[PDB]
Short mmCIF file of C-alpha atoms (C1' of nucleotides) and ligand atoms in Angstrom, two decimals:
data_model
loop_
_atom_site.label_atom_id
_atom_site.label_comp_id
_atom_site.label_asym_id
_atom_site.label_seq_id
_atom_site.Cartn_x
_atom_site.Cartn_y
_atom_site.Cartn_z
CA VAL A 1 -35.48 -17.40 19.63
CA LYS A 2 -34.27 -20.27 17.44
CA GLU A 3 -37.30 -21.09 15.22
CA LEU A 4 -37.81 -24.30 13.22
CA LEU A 5 -38.35 -23.57 9.51
CA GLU A 6 -34.73 -22.96 8.69
CA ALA A 7 -35.78 -25.70 6.32
CA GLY A 8 -37.40 -22.82 4.41
CA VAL A 9 -33.91 -21.39 4.08
CA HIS A 10 -30.87 -23.68 3.32
CA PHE A 11 -30.84 -27.30 4.75
CA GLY A 12 -27.25 -27.58 3.46
CA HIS A 13 -25.47 -28.18 0.13
CA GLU A 14 -22.36 -29.31 -1.83
CA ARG A 15 -21.82 -32.61 -3.64
CA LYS A 16 -19.12 -35.05 -2.38
CA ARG A 17 -16.53 -32.30 -1.72
CA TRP A 18 -17.05 -33.11 1.92
CA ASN A 19 -14.98 -33.66 5.02
CA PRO A 20 -15.65 -37.16 6.47
CA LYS A 21 -15.50 -35.67 9.99
CA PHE A 22 -18.82 -33.97 9.12
CA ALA A 23 -20.49 -37.38 8.76
CA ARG A 24 -22.46 -37.29 12.00
CA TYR A 25 -24.16 -34.06 10.90
CA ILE A 26 -25.55 -35.43 7.62
CA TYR A 27 -29.00 -36.90 6.88
CA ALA A 28 -28.41 -38.32 3.39
CA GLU A 29 -27.47 -37.20 -0.11
CA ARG A 30 -30.68 -36.89 -2.10
CA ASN A 31 -29.81 -34.76 -5.14
CA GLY A 32 -26.28 -36.05 -5.08
CA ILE A 33 -25.93 -33.29 -2.50
CA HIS A 34 -25.03 -33.64 1.17
CA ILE A 35 -28.14 -32.69 3.14
CA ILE A 36 -27.75 -31.65 6.76
CA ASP A 37 -29.66 -33.26 9.63
CA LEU A 38 -31.71 -30.21 10.60
CA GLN A 39 -32.49 -31.74 13.98
CA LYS A 40 -28.76 -31.76 14.60
CA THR A 41 -28.66 -28.12 13.52
CA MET A 42 -31.38 -27.43 16.08
CA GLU A 43 -29.78 -29.35 18.94
CA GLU A 44 -26.49 -27.65 18.14
CA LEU A 45 -27.98 -24.14 18.07
CA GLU A 46 -29.43 -24.88 21.50
CA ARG A 47 -25.96 -25.62 22.82
CA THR A 48 -24.33 -22.86 20.77
CA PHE A 49 -26.72 -19.98 21.46
CA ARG A 50 -26.60 -20.89 25.16
CA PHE A 51 -22.90 -20.05 24.98
CA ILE A 52 -23.59 -16.85 23.03
CA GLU A 53 -26.26 -15.52 25.40
CA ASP A 54 -24.15 -16.23 28.51
CA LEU A 55 -21.26 -14.39 26.89
CA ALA A 56 -23.46 -11.44 25.98
CA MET A 57 -24.93 -10.76 29.44
CA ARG A 58 -21.46 -11.00 30.96
CA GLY A 59 -20.43 -8.21 28.59
CA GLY A 60 -17.63 -9.53 26.40
CA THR A 61 -16.99 -9.05 22.70
CA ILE A 62 -17.51 -11.48 19.83
CA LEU A 63 -15.38 -10.98 16.71
CA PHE A 64 -17.47 -11.78 13.65
CA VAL A 65 -15.53 -13.15 10.70
CA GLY A 66 -16.83 -13.34 7.15
CA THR A 67 -14.90 -12.59 3.97
CA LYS A 68 -16.53 -14.64 1.20
CA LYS A 69 -18.47 -12.38 -1.17
CA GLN A 70 -21.89 -13.68 -0.06
CA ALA A 71 -21.36 -13.05 3.67
CA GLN A 72 -19.37 -9.84 3.05
CA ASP A 73 -22.00 -7.19 3.91
CA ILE A 74 -24.37 -9.38 5.92
CA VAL A 75 -21.74 -9.56 8.69
CA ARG A 76 -21.08 -5.82 8.63
CA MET A 77 -24.83 -5.40 9.05
CA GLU A 78 -25.60 -7.63 11.99
CA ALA A 79 -22.32 -7.18 13.87
CA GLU A 80 -22.86 -3.46 13.80
CA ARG A 81 -26.31 -4.07 15.27
CA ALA A 82 -24.56 -5.79 18.16
CA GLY A 83 -22.00 -2.99 18.17
CA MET A 84 -19.43 -5.77 18.05
CA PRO A 85 -16.26 -6.00 15.91
CA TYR A 86 -16.08 -7.81 12.59
CA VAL A 87 -13.68 -8.42 9.74
CA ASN A 88 -15.46 -8.24 6.42
CA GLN A 89 -12.66 -7.68 3.93
CA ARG A 90 -9.23 -9.36 4.18
CA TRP A 91 -8.31 -11.41 7.21
CA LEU A 92 -4.84 -10.10 8.13
CA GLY A 93 -2.54 -12.76 9.52
CA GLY A 94 -1.81 -12.09 13.17
CA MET A 95 -4.96 -10.14 13.96
CA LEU A 96 -5.10 -12.15 17.13
CA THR A 97 -1.66 -13.78 17.40
CA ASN A 98 0.06 -10.49 16.61
CA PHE A 99 -2.71 -8.28 18.03
CA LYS A 100 -0.77 -5.37 19.58
CA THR A 101 1.13 -4.90 16.29
CA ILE A 102 -1.96 -4.80 14.08
CA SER A 103 -3.54 -2.55 16.72
CA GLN A 104 -0.63 -0.22 16.04
CA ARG A 105 -2.44 0.36 12.74
CA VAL A 106 -5.76 1.52 14.17
CA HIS A 107 -3.77 4.23 16.01
CA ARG A 108 -2.65 5.33 12.55
CA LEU A 109 -6.27 5.26 11.41
CA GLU A 110 -7.08 7.03 14.69
CA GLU A 111 -4.39 9.65 14.09
CA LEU A 112 -5.61 10.12 10.52
CA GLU A 113 -9.16 10.67 11.83
CA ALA A 114 -7.83 13.56 13.91
CA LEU A 115 -5.36 15.08 11.46
CA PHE A 116 -7.96 15.16 8.66
CA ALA A 117 -10.55 16.40 11.16
CA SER A 118 -9.00 19.73 10.12
CA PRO A 119 -7.10 21.74 9.95
CA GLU A 120 -3.93 21.18 11.97
CA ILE A 121 -2.10 22.57 8.95
CA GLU A 122 -3.58 21.95 5.50
CA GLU A 123 -0.25 23.64 4.75
CA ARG A 124 1.00 20.13 4.07
CA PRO A 125 2.08 19.76 0.40
CA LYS A 126 -0.40 18.97 -2.38
CA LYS A 127 1.09 15.55 -3.07
CA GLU A 128 0.66 14.58 0.60
CA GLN A 129 -3.08 15.36 0.90
CA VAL A 130 -3.86 12.84 -1.84
CA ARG A 131 -1.57 10.29 -0.19
CA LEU A 132 -2.81 10.33 3.41
CA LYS A 133 -6.38 10.39 2.10
CA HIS A 134 -5.70 7.29 0.04
CA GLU A 135 -4.15 5.87 3.22
CA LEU A 136 -7.21 6.58 5.39
CA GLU A 137 -9.47 5.20 2.65
CA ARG A 138 -7.25 2.14 2.52
CA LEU A 139 -7.05 1.69 6.31
CA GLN A 140 -10.81 2.19 6.40
CA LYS A 141 -11.37 -0.74 4.01
CA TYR A 142 -9.70 -3.28 6.33
CA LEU A 143 -9.72 -1.96 9.90
CA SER A 144 -13.31 -0.59 9.78
CA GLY A 145 -14.69 -3.38 11.96
CA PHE A 146 -11.50 -4.45 13.69
CA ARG A 147 -10.99 -1.00 15.21
CA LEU A 148 -13.78 -1.60 17.74
CA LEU A 149 -11.67 -4.46 19.08
CA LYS A 150 -9.44 -2.78 21.62
CA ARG A 151 -8.33 -6.01 23.30
CA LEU A 152 -8.32 -9.79 22.64
CA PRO A 153 -11.87 -11.14 21.95
CA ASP A 154 -13.67 -13.57 24.26
CA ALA A 155 -14.82 -15.74 21.35
CA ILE A 156 -15.22 -15.51 17.56
CA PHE A 157 -18.02 -16.20 15.10
CA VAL A 158 -17.11 -17.55 11.69
CA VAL A 159 -19.28 -17.95 8.61
CA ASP A 160 -16.96 -20.46 6.87
CA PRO A 161 -14.38 -22.24 9.11
CA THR A 162 -12.76 -23.76 6.04
CA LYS A 163 -12.54 -20.45 4.16
CA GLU A 164 -11.43 -18.76 7.37
CA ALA A 165 -8.91 -21.43 8.33
CA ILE A 166 -6.36 -18.88 9.54
CA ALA A 167 -8.74 -17.06 11.90
CA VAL A 168 -9.86 -20.40 13.35
CA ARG A 169 -6.19 -21.28 13.87
CA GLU A 170 -5.26 -17.94 15.44
CA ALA A 171 -8.10 -17.96 17.98
CA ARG A 172 -7.49 -21.59 18.71
CA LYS A 173 -3.80 -20.88 19.28
CA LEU A 174 -5.01 -18.35 21.86
CA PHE A 175 -7.61 -20.63 23.52
CA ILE A 176 -10.22 -18.13 22.37
CA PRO A 177 -13.44 -20.13 21.76
CA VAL A 178 -14.68 -20.55 18.20
CA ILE A 179 -18.33 -20.58 17.11
CA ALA A 180 -19.05 -21.23 13.47
CA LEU A 181 -21.60 -21.71 10.76
CA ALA A 182 -20.24 -24.80 8.99
CA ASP A 183 -21.43 -26.95 6.07
CA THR A 184 -20.23 -30.39 5.01
CA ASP A 185 -16.84 -29.17 3.72
CA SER A 186 -15.63 -27.93 7.12
CA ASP A 187 -13.78 -29.61 9.97
CA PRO A 188 -16.13 -30.03 12.97
CA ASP A 189 -13.46 -30.79 15.55
CA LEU A 190 -11.81 -27.43 14.95
CA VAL A 191 -15.01 -25.63 15.96
CA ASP A 192 -16.13 -25.17 19.57
CA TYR A 193 -19.76 -24.25 18.93
CA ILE A 194 -21.18 -25.51 15.67
CA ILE A 195 -23.98 -24.34 13.47
CA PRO A 196 -24.07 -27.25 11.00
CA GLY A 197 -25.73 -25.57 8.03
CA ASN A 198 -25.25 -23.99 4.61
CA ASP A 199 -22.58 -21.25 4.68
CA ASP A 200 -23.02 -20.09 1.08
CA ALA A 201 -26.59 -18.91 0.49
CA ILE A 202 -27.05 -15.44 2.01
CA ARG A 203 -30.47 -16.58 3.21
CA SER A 204 -29.02 -19.06 5.70
CA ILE A 205 -26.30 -16.68 6.81
CA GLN A 206 -29.01 -14.07 7.35
CA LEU A 207 -31.23 -16.35 9.41
CA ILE A 208 -28.40 -17.64 11.62
CA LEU A 209 -26.41 -14.41 12.12
CA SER A 210 -29.31 -11.97 12.54
CA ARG A 211 -31.00 -14.35 14.97
CA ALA A 212 -27.59 -14.66 16.64
CA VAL A 213 -27.54 -10.91 17.19
CA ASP A 214 -31.09 -11.05 18.57
CA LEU A 215 -29.57 -13.23 21.30
CA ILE A 216 -26.74 -10.79 21.81
CA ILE A 217 -28.81 -7.59 21.88
CA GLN A 218 -31.62 -9.06 24.01
CA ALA A 219 -29.30 -10.32 26.74
CA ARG A 220 -27.38 -7.08 27.42
CA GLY A 221 -30.40 -4.76 27.73
CA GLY A 222 -33.57 -4.19 25.72
CA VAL A 223 -34.61 -6.06 22.55
CA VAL A 224 -35.58 -5.18 18.94
CA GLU A 225 -37.46 -6.34 15.85
CA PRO A 226 -36.35 -6.89 12.28
CA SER A 227 -32.93 -5.98 10.89
CA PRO A 228 -31.96 -4.89 7.32
CA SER A 229 -31.55 -7.65 4.74
CA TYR A 230 -31.59 -8.19 0.98
CA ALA A 231 -34.21 -10.55 -0.46
"C1'" C B 1 40.35 6.71 0.46
"C1'" G B 2 39.66 3.04 -3.86
"C1'" U B 3 36.22 -0.81 -5.76
"C1'" C B 4 32.02 -3.62 -6.97
"C1'" G B 5 28.15 0.67 -7.76
"C1'" U B 6 24.11 5.59 -8.29
"C1'" C B 7 24.14 -0.86 -8.90
"C1'" A B 8 18.76 -1.49 -6.05
"C1'" G B 9 19.91 -3.42 -2.92
"C1'" C B 10 20.87 -4.85 2.70
"C1'" U B 11 18.27 -5.90 7.00
"C1'" C B 12 15.38 -5.43 11.81
"C1'" G B 13 10.85 -5.83 15.30
"C1'" U B 14 6.80 -8.81 16.26
"C1'" G B 15 3.66 -12.78 14.29
"C1'" C B 16 3.48 -17.29 11.18
"C1'" C B 17 6.06 -22.05 8.92
"C1'" G B 18 10.36 -25.57 9.85
"C1'" U B 19 13.37 -30.73 14.77
"C1'" G B 20 17.10 -27.44 12.49
"C1'" A B 21 20.26 -24.39 9.30
"C1'" G B 22 16.67 -21.09 7.70
"C1'" G B 23 11.95 -19.45 5.25
"C1'" U B 24 8.10 -15.63 5.19
"C1'" G B 25 7.95 -10.23 4.78
"C1'" U B 26 11.70 -8.63 0.43
"C1'" U B 27 7.96 -13.49 -3.42
"C1'" G B 28 3.90 -12.85 -7.09
"C1'" G B 29 0.81 -9.50 -11.40
"C1'" G B 30 1.46 -4.43 -13.28
"C1'" U B 31 4.86 -0.07 -13.17
"C1'" U B 32 9.38 3.03 -12.54
"C1'" A B 33 15.53 5.74 -13.52
"C1'" A B 34 14.77 2.92 -8.41
"C1'" G B 35 12.66 -2.64 -2.64
"C1'" U B 36 9.51 3.65 -7.53
"C1'" C B 37 4.72 3.15 -6.91
"C1'" C B 38 0.07 0.16 -7.51
"C1'" C B 39 -2.78 -4.42 -6.74
"C1'" G B 40 -2.59 -9.21 -4.43
"C1'" C B 41 -0.62 -12.10 -0.41
"C1'" A B 42 0.60 -15.18 6.97
"C1'" A B 43 2.02 -11.48 7.20
"C1'" C B 44 1.83 -6.21 9.76
"C1'" G B 45 5.22 -2.47 10.43
"C1'" A B 46 10.13 -0.20 10.87
"C1'" G B 47 15.27 1.17 9.47
"C1'" C B 48 19.68 1.84 6.18
"C1'" G B 49 19.65 2.76 0.86
"C1'" C B 50 16.15 5.20 -3.67
"C1'" A B 51 13.77 10.03 -4.04
"C1'" A B 52 13.41 14.93 -1.85
"C1'" C B 53 15.61 18.78 1.11
"C1'" C B 54 21.46 21.72 -1.06
"C1'" C B 55 24.73 23.95 -5.44
"C1'" C B 56 25.30 25.48 -10.83
"C1'" C B 57 22.64 26.36 -15.56
"C1'" G B 58 17.86 27.67 -18.46
"C1'" C B 59 12.66 31.80 -18.08
"C1'" C B 60 10.62 35.68 -15.17
"C1'" G B 61 10.01 39.02 -10.99
"C1'" U B 62 11.39 42.11 -6.59
"C1'" U B 63 15.31 44.90 -4.19
"C1'" A B 64 19.82 47.66 -5.64
"C1'" G B 65 22.97 51.53 -9.92
"C1'" U B 66 29.36 51.66 -9.10
"C1'" U B 67 34.28 50.57 -10.30
"C1'" G B 68 29.01 47.90 -14.42
"C1'" C B 69 25.34 49.46 -18.32
"C1'" C B 70 23.81 53.67 -22.49
"C1'" A B 71 17.57 53.23 -24.99
"C1'" G B 72 16.47 58.82 -25.43
"C1'" C B 73 18.00 64.64 -25.10
"C1'" G B 74 22.00 67.96 -24.57
"C1'" G B 75 27.46 68.73 -25.09
"C1'" U B 76 30.88 65.14 -27.74
"C1'" U B 77 38.73 67.03 -27.49
"C1'" C B 78 36.22 62.97 -31.58
"C1'" G B 79 37.09 57.49 -26.43
"C1'" G B 80 29.92 56.15 -22.33
MG1 LIG C 301 -18.76 -23.67 1.79
MG1 LIG C 302 11.92 -29.56 5.99
MG1 LIG C 303 9.28 -23.02 16.40
MG1 LIG C 304 14.62 -15.55 9.49
MG1 LIG C 305 11.08 -12.85 11.27
MG1 LIG C 306 16.48 -8.90 -0.12
MG1 LIG C 307 15.31 -12.68 1.36
MG1 LIG C 308 6.78 -7.33 -8.36
MG1 LIG C 309 18.95 4.50 -10.16
MG1 LIG C 310 10.61 2.30 -0.67
MG1 LIG C 311 3.83 -7.93 0.11
MG1 LIG C 312 24.96 33.79 -15.57
#
RNA sequence: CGUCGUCAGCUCGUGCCGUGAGGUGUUGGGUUAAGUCCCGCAACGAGCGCAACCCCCGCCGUUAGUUGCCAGCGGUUCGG
């Protein structure tokens, strides 16, 4: 499912703001820009997707993590396709390490779903309606994707392992495997299954994540053709 | 019971950082009479305080009309 002209969309970036541990995944710096060995990206995807597929057909969740503005929506898109949890907005410390406690906050969201499902007394004061609404709206912003996650994930998918340092550290502290799209400014050794490629351009994120989902959806029953994306 | 002080504060649970005392939260930007509320944040919640629920006063209504009141009509000893 992997394709070959990802060259058409990314082959890496960033001038010498690199992490030396990312050396083995670099071809050269042509424009004064670290360019990624796309053959390495291929070979890695082969190893990585193999892990993904196996995890899919054994029926276990993958928590997709993206928070940078460019990968914001694109992860809500494709993770929804998989029907798998994501965190798009703020990564709340202890989402894994303090799971049960954060999960105490979906119940609130849950209980606000029901209460506002009407009426169960709209005879609650004026000032309260506005409040609890603002609450639900609020809760909705952050726990929208995390609410699907009803128990500790089997692995996580990160768009930027550097940006998402905390998440990488939480999962790792829990022996939960970590798969990641990572460019030259990330730390390879911290990542279990690497996608050495640009993590900034939405194009690359789109290619890698959508095609990642195509692995997920295909392996747990049926398949499907193209998924929503901005040019 | 007094006092600091009606001052806006004092903490806990779990997670995170530290060998450790302990830190974080509770800091930060805005706001309020207020840890008041908003936004942000390795923190996410919870409690005791704050506030509100109570009393008096200020406007109005309903229910009542004496021992209280007297607008209007009668007597009016000349004082509802
Ligand atoms: Mg980057
Ligand atoms: Mg020290
Ligand atoms: Mg320790
Ligand atoms: Mg402490
Ligand atoms: Mg603590
Ligand atoms: Mg304090
Ligand atoms: Mg303190
Ligand atoms: Mg402040
Ligand atoms: Mg005060
Ligand atoms: Mg408060
Ligand atoms: Mg805070
Ligand atoms: Mg009076």
